[PDB]
Amino acid sequence: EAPNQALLRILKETEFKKIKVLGSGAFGTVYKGLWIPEGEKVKIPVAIKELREATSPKANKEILDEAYVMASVDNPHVCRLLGICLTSTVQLITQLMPFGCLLDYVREHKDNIGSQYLLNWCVQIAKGMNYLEDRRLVHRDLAARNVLVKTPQHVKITDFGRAKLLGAEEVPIKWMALESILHRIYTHQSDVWSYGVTVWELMTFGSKPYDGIPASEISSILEKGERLPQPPICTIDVYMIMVKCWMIDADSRPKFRELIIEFSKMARDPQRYLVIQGDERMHLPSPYRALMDEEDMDDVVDADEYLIPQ
């Protein structure tokens, strides 16, 4: 196979300061932070994710593996790893996304969320997924929760902890495809099914899937031929696309490139495909933004605009 020549970058702790805790879960906590490269004189807003001071080795293999994947991908619609800090315990530095995860975002802003936005995200997510397919990577955990908003217009995929190379030996039941659920079989197409759910989450503005239903339950339910309900705002076409994602035969499921194309068409005439009350009225925020508490963000540069050789 091809050699991975991605460069892994190591950063001194002195380089960045962690302002706040974005979230804490399990043994891992993520902080909003500012990173300054050594001679660069640029300030970068970053998220630092560190697994616990507890340094259990099993965990470490896990965090490092995720970083390896993140280091290895370049796309507008996929999150990438800025570098790593080895002090005390490994931490991952990646560009901060100000608006947080999409799933939270839909729930919070649902009244103000446009049809055009929903389709665009749908298109954007597909583009990111397609890139991974190009890189032969199976995310193996795509969810609305795992999509981050740089801006309302722009979103990218993340959480590559579960990611594996295709055909490699090497738990979100609801997202998971049936083949994966029954047989622990994962393929991009398995990935595609997950995308369909993600679309469903967005379409319903963050509604839970198979809500009130136990996970053990799900395999049979799927077995029956049951599937998620058409969302109220979903036109028959848009829904129909979703259903294809949930097909028993994976080869039957639509390819990611195909998905990008179909949604893209809809985005031209968003109103036709999604019906929302007051669609015209809604508008959404943009970035200065200075979310971090700094007087001096003259030099702030986004990670997207911050580049290094190779």
Ligand X SMILES: CN1CCN(c2ccc(Nc3ncc4nc(Nc5ccccc5)n(C5CCCCC5)c4n3)cc2)CC1
- The residues carrying an active-site annotation are 141
Show the binding pattern over residues 47-76: x = contacts ligand X (CB under 6 A), - = does not.
x-x---------------------------
Rounded to whole angstroms, the Cα distance separating 144 from 103 reads 5
CB of 210 to Cl ion, least distance (A): 9
Q: Is 100 in the site for ligand X (CB under 6 A)?
A: yes
Q: Which stretch binds ligand X (CB under 6 A): 35-43, 92-100, 127-135, 256-264?
A: 92-100
Is residue 30 a known part of a binding site?
yes
Q: Is 206 in the site for ligand X (CB under 6 A)?
A: no
- Choose, by CB under 6 A, the member of 7, 23, 134, 226 that binds ligand X: 23
Show the binding pattern over residues 167-196: x = contacts Cl ion (CB under 5 A), - = does not.
-----xxx----------------------
Q: How far is CA 59 from the centre of its chain?
A: 22
Is residue 49 a known part of a binding site?
yes
Is residue 148 a known part of a binding site?
no
Q: Is 94 in the site for ligand X (CB under 6 A)?
A: yes
Q: Is 162 in the site for ligand X (CB under 6 A)?
A: no
Q: Is-contact 139 162, C-beta < 8 A?
A: yes
Is residue 225 a known part of a binding site?
no
Rg (CA), the chain: 20
Alpha-carbon distance values, 47 to 93, 148, 219, 224, 233 (Å): 6, 12, 36, 43, 34
Q: Which residue has the tokens 């963000």?
A: 297
Burial class of residue 258 (count of CB atoms within 10 Å of its CB; 0-12, 13-18, 19+): middle
Is residue 196 a known part of a binding site?
no
18 binds, among ligand X, Cl ion, none (CB under 5 to 8 A by kind): none
**Nearer CB in complex with ligand X: 129/149:** 149
Q: Is the dihedral of CA 43, 49, 52, 57 positive or negative?
A: negative
Q: Which stretch binds ligand X (CB under 6 A): 10-18, 91-99, 112-120, 255-263?
A: 91-99
The token duo for 82 is 């800025």
91 binds, among Cl ion, ligand X, none (CB under 5 to 8 A by kind): none
28 binds, among Cl ion, ligand X, none (CB under 5 to 8 A by kind): none
Closest alpha carbon to 198 in 274, 267, 124, 248: 124
Phi, psi of 207 (to 5 degrees): -60, 145
Closest alpha carbon to 201 in 191, 211, 190: 211
**Nearer CB in complex with ligand X: 94/198:** 94
Question: Which residues are within 8 A (CB) of 155 and not within 5 positions of it... i.e. 6 or more apart?
Answer: 77, 102, 121, 124, 125, 147, 148, 149
Alpha-carbon distance values, 69 to 115, 155, 187 (Å): 33, 19, 17
CB of 226 to Cl ion, least distance (A): 16
Rounded to whole angstroms, the Cα distance separating 125 from 245 reads 14
CB of 166 to ligand X, least distance (A): 22
Is residue 29 a known part of a binding site?
yes
Residues in contact with ligand X by CB under 6 A are 22-23, 30, 47, 49, 92, 94, 96-98, 100-101, 104, 148, 158-159
Q: Contact residues for Cl ion (CB under 5 A)?
A: 172-174
Residues placed in the known binding site for ATP: 22-30, 49, 94-95, 159
